[PDB]
Amino acid sequence: PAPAWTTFRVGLFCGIFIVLNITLVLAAVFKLETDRSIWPLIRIYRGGFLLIEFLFLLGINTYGWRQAGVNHVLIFELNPRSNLSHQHLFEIAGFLGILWCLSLLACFFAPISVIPTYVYPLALYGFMVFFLINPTKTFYYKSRFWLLKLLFRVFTAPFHKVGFADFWLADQLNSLSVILMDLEYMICFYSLELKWDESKGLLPNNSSGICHKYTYGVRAIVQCIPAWLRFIQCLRRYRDTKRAFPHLVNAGKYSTTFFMVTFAALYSTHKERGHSDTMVFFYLWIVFYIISSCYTLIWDLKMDWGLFDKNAGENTFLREEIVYPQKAYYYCAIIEDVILRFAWTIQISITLPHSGDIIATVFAPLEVFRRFVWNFFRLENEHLNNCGEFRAV
Amino acid sequence: PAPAWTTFRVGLFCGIFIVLNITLVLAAVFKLETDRSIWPLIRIYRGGFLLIEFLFLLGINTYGWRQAGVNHVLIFELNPRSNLSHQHLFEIAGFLGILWCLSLLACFFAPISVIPTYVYPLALYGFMVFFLINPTKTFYYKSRFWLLKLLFRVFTAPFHKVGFADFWLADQLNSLSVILMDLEYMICFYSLELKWDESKGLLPNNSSGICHKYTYGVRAIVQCIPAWLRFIQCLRRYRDTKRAFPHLVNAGKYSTTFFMVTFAALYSTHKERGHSDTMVFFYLWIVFYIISSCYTLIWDLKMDWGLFDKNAGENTFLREEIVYPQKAYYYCAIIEDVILRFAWTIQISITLPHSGDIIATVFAPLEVFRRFVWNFFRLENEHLNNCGEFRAV
Ligand SMILES: CCCCCCCCCCCCCCCCCC(=O)OC[C@H](COP(=O)(O)OCCN)OC(=O)CCCCCCCCCCCCC
Ligand SMILES: CCCCCCCCCCCCCCCCCC(=O)OC[C@H](COP(=O)(O)OCCN)OC(=O)CCCCCCCCCCCCC
Numbered sequence A, B: 001p002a003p004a005w006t007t008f009r010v011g012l013f014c015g016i017f018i019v020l021n022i023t024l025v026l027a028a029v030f031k032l033e034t035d036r037s038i039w040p041l042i043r044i045y046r047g048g049f050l051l052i053e054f055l056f057l058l059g060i061n062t063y064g065w066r067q068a069g070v071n072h073v074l075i076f077e078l079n080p081r082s083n084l085s086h087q088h089l090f091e092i093a094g095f096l097g098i099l100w101c102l103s104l105l106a107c108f109f110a111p112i113s114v115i116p117t118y119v120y121p122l123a124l125y126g127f128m129v130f131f132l133i134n135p136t137k138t139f140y141y142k143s144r145f146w147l148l149k150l151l152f153r154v155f156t157a158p159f160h161k162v163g164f165a166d167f168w169l170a171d172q173l174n175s176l177s178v179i180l181m182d183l184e185y186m187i188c189f190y191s192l193e194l195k196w197d198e199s200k201g202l203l204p205n206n207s208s209g210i211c212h213k214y215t216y217g218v219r220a221i222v223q224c225i226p227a228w229l230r231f232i233q234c235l236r237r238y239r240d241t242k243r244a245f246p247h248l249v250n251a252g253k254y255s256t257t258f259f260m261v262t263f264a265a266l267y268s269t270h271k272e273r274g275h276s277d278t279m280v281f282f283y284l285w286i287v288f289y290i291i292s293s294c295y296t297l298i299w300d301l302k303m304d305w306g307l308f309d310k311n312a313g314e315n316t317f318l319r320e321e322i323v324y325p326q327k328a329y330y331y332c333a334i335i336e337d338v339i340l341r342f343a344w345t346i347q348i349s350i351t352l353p354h355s356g357d358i359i360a361t362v363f364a365p366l367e368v369f370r371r372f373v374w375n376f377f378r379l380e381n382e383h384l385n386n387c388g389e390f391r392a393v
């Protein structure tokens, strides 16, 4: 198992997190100003919230993979000596989620003198970066180094060889593209919008902004920077393997992801300008959201998971062999990976007015939950079918 | 060891406790009224605070006894099958200390409608009793029943046989007599002082009370109800063993505890009345505090612990054999069991005006700490010397 101090730290951090969350809710109901816009803060903190949520669901995944015998230490090609058990991710999640609640609380109370209240997001997202690139061999240096060496083979896409960890993380970034949007919004807001002279700044004097629009191609390019990576990765895998079916057909789906965003952006620009030929684009976009919400779905079931098989037997649209104990799980996941998959690319085109933002903030933790369920059966099908194509035996 | 859920609960409760304590301090600095007396609440909550503190130091003791090999399962005559490890007392302490902080916080905010704010101490000290006398076999029913059957052989003193658990708890109640004083104050305050019509009540409209004085022979009788028990227990042990030295000389020390309290009470009554012959008592009291602060001290070292031995050897006023690893511990305890033991019976005679209360509240957690250090070497000397006189071999 794990030492008795690691479980103590897990519990301590989760308790502090719970109490600080309740205090956050109460202070937001009572101590709030209710006179200035709160969105320039909601986005900046929504990024980090999605990160913390993702780091806890990934701790639950590493427990489900071990209880069911998936052997994720050979698939990732990890080291069978030292690995992060679920209690080592439940611990980083809580630690980084304590500072998030502390920053969000200080941005409400501002319980200090002349120091401005816009330095708290900078402090939080500076500490979150310096926790990762600490050169001193402490606080999980082996894991952070294994992750830093690998976040470098992903962003420089076509110059390396694609292993399962590169593919897994590059596909994990597809459902985590809100972090990039909110990391771009922080920069464009701190650069040319927030007035440093005023002592409040983060909640500006209003109740009209220039960085959350689909602007001159810089919100759309960051929106699908996580599809460009996997497009090039599949093209490289085709260039190397020469098996033209799976890799080319696969890249043809991120290709569709490319068209939806550009057509939505074109329509948005044309109407915010007020051109007469705007509506012709709105008919095209709808075709790409219907085309690409299906392409990525009939691929999750038939090829990623491998469920709708012909020689199933008694399993009624599942595989011949299943690993997870029960059998209702495979049907709840099937019914969920269509409901949550339709809404996922609404939120990619949609990222319209202030009613078009309480939808993005609500659906953002539902694209990091759909990936949490993807990770469960992708790894299982990779274990007993080797369908990724990445292992000789 | 222990299951991985018990350590998680330990950590969770300690984290919630820490955060709620910091919130308590902040709300007492800021949200306070600063217009009404706060003592009628300080006493009522000081009782429960001492209880919670005692239940955590006793968890540390059960760890020190096991790491050093004291074998407290045979001395107490426990069951070698199921016993509370230190993590099962670290858990009850935190659980009961969460409700304490919640009650103390509600008494500050009063964050509910017409319901009065004096029902929170009643709620807390009703739940603390009903956690113990739950007939349903859940939430440590074996331990709570072993304790309830034994709190009955202690209060009915001379009709049972004195084992080590009876003596141990009856001597533990000597340094926990503030709980009884604050349980008597709660009753005499809720009975004839607090006006139920007013919605605040607990903080009365003032900045003159009739229940914390050394009153007509009730505060003093409850003050030394924990010395009467051990007096009778030693008399019974003499009646049975017929060895007249240790038991009679032992009872002769709680006899001295009896005289200090009555002389202090006589002096206090005579001066608050204003009699001319008051000061003659103040010379007697001082003789009993000097006589009885020495009697109980030269007994802790020579007979309870057994340190100042003649055949020590190289241990320089310790035993021939010592169990705890280091050797500075035995000297810090020697130097502490005189400093903290002089002040212990100041606080018994004292319990004088409002300057005579910030001393009792401050010294109350220093008589529950001096028993925390007693428990360490009493059990060790009982282990390797059998000096209690309670085991044939
Ligand atoms: C504005 C908002 C911006 C926020 C910026 C924040 C930057 C990043 C801060 C995140 C902190 C994450 C801490 C590091 C987590 C380490 C997890 C890890 O790598 O372990 C994964 C585990 C196997 O790791 P082992 O250590 O056992 O390997 C040992 C032998 N070499 O086995 C596994 O299952 C793999 C799990 C890997 C976790 C992947 C996390 C990816 C997160 C980085 C993406 C960031 C872009 C936004
Ligand atoms: C106004 C303020 C008033 C407050 C009123 C509150 C009333 C009491 C509420 C207290 C809750 C305490 C919960 C019970 C604690 C149980 C601890 C216990 O008994 O275990 C002690 C342990 C051995 O116990 P085992 O269960 O292993 O025995 C099994 C086989 N028969 O081995 C040990 O080392 C012994 C430890 C025993 C702890 C003794 C605690 C004594 C506290 C009661 C005194 C109360 C008077 C104020």
Ligand SMILES: CC(C)CCC[C@@H](C)[C@H]1CC[C@H]2[C@@H]3CC=C4C[C@@H](O)CC[C@]4(C)[C@H]3CC[C@]12C
Residues within 6 Å of the ligand: A064, A067, A068, A324, A325, A329, A332, A333, A335, A336, A373, A376
């Ligand atoms: C109708 C919809 C919304 C239902 C929601 C689907 C969710 C709750 C279902 C679908 C996938 C399921 C998971 C699939 C497999 C495992 C592995 C197992 O060892 C623990 C249960 C666990 C961890 C399941 C938890 C429940 C689960 C997450």
Ligand SMILES: CC(C)CCC[C@@H](C)[C@H]1CC[C@H]2[C@@H]3CC=C4C[C@@H](O)CC[C@]4(C)[C@H]3CC[C@]12C
Residues within 6 Å of the ligand: B064, B067, B068, B324, B325, B329, B332, B333, B335, B336, B373, B376
């Ligand atoms: C000068 C005075 C105030 C010093 C304070 C004395 C205190 C801190 C000393 C005296 C008795 C000591 C304890 C005696 C023995 C043990 C058992 C051992 O396995 C752990 C250390 C521990 C738990 C010690 C902790 C430190 C201790 C509590």
